[PDB]
Each structure stands twice: as C-alpha cells, then as structure tokens.
Amino acid sequence: TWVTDKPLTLKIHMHFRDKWVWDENWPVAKESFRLTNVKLQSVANKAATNSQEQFNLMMASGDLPDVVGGDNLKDKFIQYGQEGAFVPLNKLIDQYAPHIKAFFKSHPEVERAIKAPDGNIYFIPYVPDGVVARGYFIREDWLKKLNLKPPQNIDELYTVLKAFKEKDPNGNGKADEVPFIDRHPDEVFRLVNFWGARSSGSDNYMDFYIDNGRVKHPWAETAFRDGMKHVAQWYKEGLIDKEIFTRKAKAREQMFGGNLGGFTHDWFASTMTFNEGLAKTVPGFKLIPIAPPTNSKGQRWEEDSRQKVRPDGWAITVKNKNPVETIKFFDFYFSRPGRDISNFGVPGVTYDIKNGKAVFKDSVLKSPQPVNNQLYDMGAQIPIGFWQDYDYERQWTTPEAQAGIDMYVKGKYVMPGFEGVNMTREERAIYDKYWADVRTYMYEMGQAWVMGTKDVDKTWDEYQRQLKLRGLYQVLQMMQQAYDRQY
C-alpha cells in the first residue's frame, strides 16, 4: 500500500470536535505512515477549545499547511476552495485516486452533495455507514423502583421525568436526580419534537429542511417558538440538566456513572454499553431504548438519522508541493486496508483479519468505554476523509441495542434527512455572507430561551426582525431558488 518511494512528511491542520488534533504518533497514524509511507505532522493548537475558530484563525494568518481537516468544514472547503486556498481534486481523483473514483461511481449523490458551485471537488469527505443514529433511552431500573411504566406520550414523559426528579429513585434521600441529560447540548432544542416542532432537517444540528417543497429553517417557525415555551418550563422545573450547555462530552460518564440521570437522546451503540460498563459501580443500572413518546400532535418523531455523507473531511492546500502523492494518500482511506485501520485501529492491537475481514477482539469489546471512544484516542473513527464500515459498529452493538434499532426501523420513526441543495455561485455567496452569522445568533437566543434569560413569546417578534435584518430570509430565498431548479 505504499504511495511514495521516499517518506513524505506533510503539515496538517486538523482541529475537530473542540477537543482533538491530529497526532503523528497515534497508533493508527503510526500505522498509516507505515502502510502509506506518508507522515502527517500537526501544526494545530493542542490547547485550543474551538475547532471552527482554529480553522478561521489559520485562514487569517495566511500561513497554510499541506492538508486541512476536520468536522463541519464543508462550507469553508467550498468557499475558500473557490477562492483558491484549496485545490480542486477532480483531475487528481480521476487520474490517481481509483478507490475514490469507484466510490463516487457507485455513490453519485455523495459526489454531488460535496461539490462546489464551480463543479469542483475541494475535499474528501467522511462517509458514515449505518441507517439510524440517535434514539431515546430511559432508566428502566428507576421505572421499576418507582412502579412506573415507560412513557407512551409527552404527557406520560412529563409525569415520568417529574417522578425521577421528586421521588428519589436512587434512594439516598437527596433530590439529586437529573431527569434529562445529554452529552450534546443541542439535544435540548430537539426536545421541541415532543410538541410537534422540528429542530433540524438532519443529523446536523440547526439544519434546514424541506416542508412540502418549501425550504424552511426550523428555528424560524412559530412551531419552534411554541415548543421552546415548554422546553423552557422543563428547564425551570429542573427536569433538564442545569449544566446542559456546559457539561458536554462526558455527560454520560458523569450523570449515568454518578447515578443522577434518568433519560437521554443519544446513539444506540455507545449509550447501551453503559449497562455493562456501570454494572458494578451502579448495581442494577439498566437503560432501555423506547419508542419516541407520542408528541402533542399525535405522532412519534425520530428526527435524527445517519447521514449519507458528513460535512467533514480533509483538503489539499495550494501550498502542498506534493498533490499527487497526497491524493494517493487520500485514496488509501477508501481502499480496504485504509478502511481497516481508519475503522478498526491497528492489527494485532485492536483487531485481526479473520476470514477476510477485520475482527476486534475482547479487551476492546468489554471495556466500560464505548469502542469508538477507544478508537478516537488512537486515531481511528476520526473525521478525515475515510469510508466508515458499519461492520465495525455491529461488532459492539449489544442485542438490547439491536432490538432498539429494529424497533425504530420497523416503527418508521426516523424522519428522512435533508440532502442539501446545489446553489449557483451567486446563491451560495449570499449563503456564505449570512448563514454562519444567523446560525450563531440563533443559538445564543435559544440558549437564552431554554435557560430563562429571555422569554420566547416576549422576544419572538424582535427575534424575527433580527432574522430578517441579518439575512435569514434572503438565504432561504436563495436555497428555495436552487431547490426549484431541482423541483
């Protein structure tokens, strides 16, 4: 699998998920270098805590590396690619990247989704593998202790969460229970689904969506305002983690491991590992998947789904003096041996090739830490350009977790996600000038609403004014225009 005759050292700026950078001595990166003869060296800031700021600051310094990578960079790969900071990959892929060329061959909608208005491919994306993403999970051992049954609608959800709060299910005499926790703060806004309001059109938070041939953004609709009215009341009543916006990554380890949380919306595989992982420290701990409790409008909504392609990956800068070797290095991660390490880690360390496929073995499968959390720490399952393989995830999907997935599929609960729109140069330019600005202001207002710093009703009108003056509806007009060119 070597691509270059002499070892090639490339500078990567890859800051992702507000917590991590590329490591040259990751066991997977050490194995990457070993298989490809291409070494990557991180120039990103270790200690920094905002991946988008780091990309921006890097762009602002004029000092680019050879490779830029990370999560949530699709819009910037496209915008700065058109400006000439990243090179178009079309001819390189066609001539030097066969596995990628074969992937786009059998995945034409992926290649279309990641392209720029000028028709150029400016990064290689992270391609997820799977169907469902998040579901709802509740403490059945608390339900049992309190003599409750799983909630079937929002009315019963409220009653059950109230009981977790008020009737001491951990039995320590203290009102320490925190009914709803989530390691992703944006899930608190997705709670508006339970009153029949969208929070996002996709697995990307605050995403647009299509409603009957009309592009909308969910946080602009009156339905969102009404939903936030109940969400704010829940926060006020202490049903939602007071620290929901600041606890973040390790909220499961903290709130479940400390026997404080009763309820969450998270991924099936990893969340269900905690039953085993906490089996000794919290005797009797048992999370179960439940169907989405029927919302106030009489429907069961699972808004989240696995994406066909995520807005993450890596790109080749103009400064890169070895574009050919780099694109071959990219191609490695769409080949079977690249998929092997990027999904499974290091052979003889986390997996072996058994019957022609990577099979994990048992030190990893039984860790109290979910398998994908272990793989991050060694450089696998990271948002480079690589073709994820659901076989890696099936191997640590417990039977109880699998029964949840099957329930959600059978039940039809998973709403189809927004696949995107193909804008023109002018349309996407308006999108570039306004959306990030609008998205930030939206988040700050909702955090305010959830926490009770501002009232939803009393600020809704001035909110809609800001939406209009900051260009939200002009962005919508341009997306609709591009949607109409497809419909």
Ligand X SMILES: O=C(O)[C@H]1O[C@@H](O[C@H]2[C@H](O)[C@H](O)[C@H](O[C@H]3[C@H](O)[C@H](O)[C@H](O[C@H]4[C@H](O)[C@H](O)[C@H](O[C@H]5[C@H](O)[C@H](O)[C@H](O)O[C@@H]5C(=O)O)O[C@@H]4C(=O)O)O[C@@H]3C(=O)O)O[C@@H]2C(=O)O)[C@@H](O)[C@@H](O)[C@@H]1O
Numbered residues of the known binding site:
130, 168, 170, 172, 174, 176-177, 433, 437
- Going through 235-393 in order, the beta strands assigned E by DSSP cover 261-267, 287-290, 313-316, 351-353, 358-360
Among 27, 35, 205, 286, which residue interacts with ligand X (rule: CB under 6 A)? 205
For residue 436, the 8-state DSSP code is: H
- Going through 317-360 in order, the beta strands assigned E by DSSP cover 351-353, 358-360
Enumerate long-range contacts of 277-281, CB under 8 Å, 24 or more apart: 277/367, 277/368, 277/369, 278/368, 281/257
Among 37, 296, 322, 372, which residue interacts with ligand X (rule: CB under 6 A)? 372
Is 393 one of the binding residues for ligand X (CB under 6 A)?
yes
Is 381 one of the binding residues for ligand X (CB under 6 A)?
yes
Least distance from Ca ion to the Cβ atom of residue 438, Å: 9
Q: Which of residues 444-483 bind ligand X (CB under 6 A)?
A: none
- Binding part of the chain for ligand X, among 188-196, 263-271, 360-368, 476-484 by CB under 6 A, reads 263-271
Q: Collect all residues with Cβ–Cβ distance below 8 Å to 466 and sequence separation of at least 6.
A: 441
For Ca ion, the closer of residues 53 and 377 by Cβ is 53
Q: Which does 34 bind (CB under 5 to 8 A by kind): Ca ion, ligand X, none?
A: none
Site string for ligand X, 64-93 (x = CB under 6 A): -------xx---------------------
Site residue total, Ca ion (CB under 5 A): 8
Q: Which of residues 419-458 bind Ca ion (CB under 5 A)?
A: 433, 437
Alpha-carbon span 365 to 457, nearest angstrom: 49
Is 443 one of the binding residues for ligand X (CB under 6 A)?
yes
Give SS3 for 7. Answer: coil
Q: Which of residues 200-229 bind Ca ion (CB under 5 A)?
A: none
Is 395 one of the binding residues for ligand X (CB under 6 A)?
no
For ligand X, the closer of residues 205 and 473 by Cβ is 205
Alpha helix (H) residue ranges in 167-311: 187-190, 222-236, 251, 268-277
Least distance from ligand X to the Cβ atom of residue 371, Å: 8
Is 109 one of the binding residues for Ca ion (CB under 5 A)?
no
Q: After which residues is the chain broken (C to N over 2.5 A)?
A: none
Give SS3 for 388. Answer: coil
Q: Please give the structure tokens belonging to residue 38.
A: 């291409």
424 membership: H or E segment, kind and range:
none
- Binding part of the chain for Ca ion, among 275-283, 304-312, 370-378, 446-454 by CB under 5 A, reads 304-312
- Chain Cα centroid distance, residue 106: 24
Among 45, 52, 152, 474, which residue interacts with ligand X (rule: CB under 6 A)? 52
Alpha-carbon span 81 to 118, nearest angstrom: 10
Planar angle of CA 302, 304, 310, nearest 5 degrees? 165
- HSE toward the beta carbon, residue 172, CA cutoff 13 A: 10
Site string for ligand X, 180-199 (x = CB under 6 A): ------x-------------
Is 369 one of the binding residues for ligand X (CB under 6 A)?
no
Q: Which does 259 bind (CB under 5 to 8 A by kind): Ca ion, ligand X, none?
A: none
For ligand X, the closer of residues 75 and 221 by Cβ is 75
Among 12, 38, 228, 269, which residue interacts with ligand X (rule: CB under 6 A)? 269
For Ca ion, the closer of residues 21 and 401 by Cβ is 401
Among 96, 224, 267, 449, which residue interacts with ligand X (rule: CB under 6 A)? 267
Least distance from Ca ion to the Cβ atom of residue 331, Å: 22
Contact 245, 231 (CB under 8 A): no
Alpha-carbon span 68 to 58, nearest angstrom: 10
For ligand X, the closer of residues 78 and 442 by Cβ is 442
Is 50 one of the binding residues for ligand X (CB under 6 A)?
yes
End-to-end CA distance of the chain: 44
Question: What number of helices (H) and strands (E) belong to the chain?
Answer: 21, 14
Which residues in this chain contact ligand X in the complex, by CB under 6 A? 17-18, 50-52, 71-72, 186, 205, 267, 269-270, 310, 370, 372, 381, 393, 440, 443
Which residues in this chain contact Ca ion in the complex, by CB under 5 A? 168, 170, 172, 174, 176, 306, 433, 437
